[PDB]
Amino acid sequence: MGTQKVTPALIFAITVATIGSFQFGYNTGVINAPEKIIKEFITKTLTDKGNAPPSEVLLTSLWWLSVAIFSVGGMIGSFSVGLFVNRFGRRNSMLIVNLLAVTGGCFMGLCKVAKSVEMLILGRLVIGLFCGLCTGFVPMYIGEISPTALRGAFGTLNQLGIVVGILVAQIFGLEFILGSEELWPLLLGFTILPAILQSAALPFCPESPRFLLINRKEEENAKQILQRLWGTQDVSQDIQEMKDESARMSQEKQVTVLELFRVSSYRQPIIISIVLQLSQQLSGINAVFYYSTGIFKDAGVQEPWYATIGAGVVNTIFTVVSLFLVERAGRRTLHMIGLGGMAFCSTLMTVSLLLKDNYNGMSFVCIGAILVFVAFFEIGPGPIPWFIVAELFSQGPRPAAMAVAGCSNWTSNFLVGLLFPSAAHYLGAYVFIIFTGFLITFLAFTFFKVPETRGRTFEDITRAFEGQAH
Ligand SMILES: CCCCCCCC/C=C/CCCCCCCC(=O)OC[C@H](O)CO
Ligand SMILES: CCCCCCCC/C=C\CCCCCCCC(=O)OC[C@H](O)CO
Ligand SMILES: CCCCCCCC/C=C\CCCCCCCC(=O)OC[C@H](O)CO
Ligand SMILES: OC[C@H]1O[C@H](O)[C@H](O)[C@@H](O)[C@@H]1O
């Protein structure tokens, strides 16, 4: 660490940033529990306005839209971060977009008294736009303000917020809390509250000193912010690394999305970045989490909702585990262990499901395979892809790279949700071998293609990619 310290100022800045991480997880998970309540609302709204009750095809379509419009907004929002972070800075970008969070949350809080299914859909679209921007803003901000030796650990706090957000959404979704016919608008409108908290706290967070020095050429301002955030007057190594990056950025054209696919020096890290996002989403994690309740039920769990909250607890615990390991073990090891362990668990889900009606006891194996699958996911493929893109690029290309990577994350998220019900319909229990195939494929890619970034400066990582490109 040299003289660099973890100050209360640093903890404060990063915690406040990860409120957007909490928003992404909360809004990802909140919609699942009140599904029947919300379909009832859709039917009652369509009839109360005169129309004939929806068929189940129509109800399913409108519910699918209510869920999926979120991912569409996330695809658009994540791809749009480059429009914000260089124009307003990283800190102010997070501040401004909470207008989206409050607006989207109000559309969802008010759709029932407005008797407006459109307002529900618009809300989920707006909150997806917000969350898409967040999933880009937060790791960029944390990656740019963390000490190098702790960039991975601090990067994992983003995923910690996501999984804490999911767990809170599951808990609030319990019917004796907010997941009731009366209170489900509050379950969705809750997202306004973190946003108000974060917006109150963000002015007191520092701008990224890398943004200030490199993008804005304010060396003295950056240096002062670094000295306070890290609790030391000696920041010469880091300042000089930033001046190196500033010199490099000055000598290369402004980076565009398309250019990331033309320049050889950028093509390797952007392929890595995109592939690592796929390895997260094409693990099937959101298919496994969402369908876990029905799988638990078919395995005999008498109260399957508490087993899914158990999965959410496991999801949180092993994010903390990854947090305390990623600087020791490094990115490669944790990510590969997660992919490999998930490969085993998804395969075991297929095997247990195929045998459980014949072999007494395999039901307990289905239950364990789901829970262990989630633990392995959070060892690496959960947290690492969200923060790794920030450390794979230097200052100039990072916003356009994270726009692309994040969009690929949301798009593959969408594609799993789009295609999984059909594949499960044809393949039954074999559907999880599809995720096994991706997991194994991406484990091979990781072992052969993903450099170790732990404890390395951005300049050192970028130089290695340029050396390879030569
Ligand atoms: C000033 C007026 C504000 C209005 C008052 C309403 C505030 C109530 C909000 C409660 C939930 C907030 C949850 C915020 C999310 C916590 C972030 C997190 O989970 O941390 C991630 C990781 O641990 C790295 O810190
Ligand atoms: C739980 C009561 C059962 C009755 C209602 C059945 C639906 C709930 C099923 C799983 C909840 C999982 C919540 C945790 C969040 C999972 C993460 C996720 O990806 O959500 C799925 C996707 O957003 C949208 O399909
Ligand atoms: C007839 C289809 C079922 C009715 C609607 C329920 C499905 C969720 C709706 C859109 C998925 C949006 C894509 C992003 C969602 C995350 C991936 C996911 O959750 O996959 C599981 C999903 O429930 C399915 O496979
Ligand atoms: O905890 C798992 C959640 O976080 C992951 O990093 C993904 O961003 C999200 O799709 C998933 O539902």
Numbering used by the authors: 1 to 470
Paper quotes:
The major facilitator superfamily (MFS) glucose transporters (GLUTs), encoded by the SLC2 genes, mediate the transmembrane movement of various hexoses and derivatives in different tissues. The two domains, which exhibit a 2-fold pseudosymmetry around an axis that is perpendicular to the membrane plane, enclose a central cavity for substrate accommodation. Exposure of the substrate-binding site to either side of the membrane is achieved through rocker-switch rotation of the two domains as well as local conformational changes exemplified by the bending of TM722. The ligands that specifically bind to the outward- or inward-facing conformers of a transporter, wherein the substrate binding pocket is accessible to the extracellular or intracellular milieu, respectively, are defined as the exofacial or endofacial inhibitors.
This variant will be referred to as GLUT3exo hereafter. The two bulky substituents were expected to trap GLUT3 in an outward-facing conformation. Consistently, the transport activity of GLUT3exo was abolished as measured in proteoliposome-based counterflow assay. As expected, GLUT3exo exhibits an outward-facing state with a glucose molecule standing in its central pocket. The two bulky residues, Trp64 and Trp305, wedge into the two lateral interfaces of the N and C domains, i.e., between TM2 and TM11 and between TM5 and TM8, respectively, to lock the outward-facing conformation. Except for these two Trp substitutions, the structure of GLUT3exo is nearly identical to that of the outward-occluded GLUT3-glucose with a root-mean-square deviation (RMSD) of 0.236 Å over 402 Cα atoms.
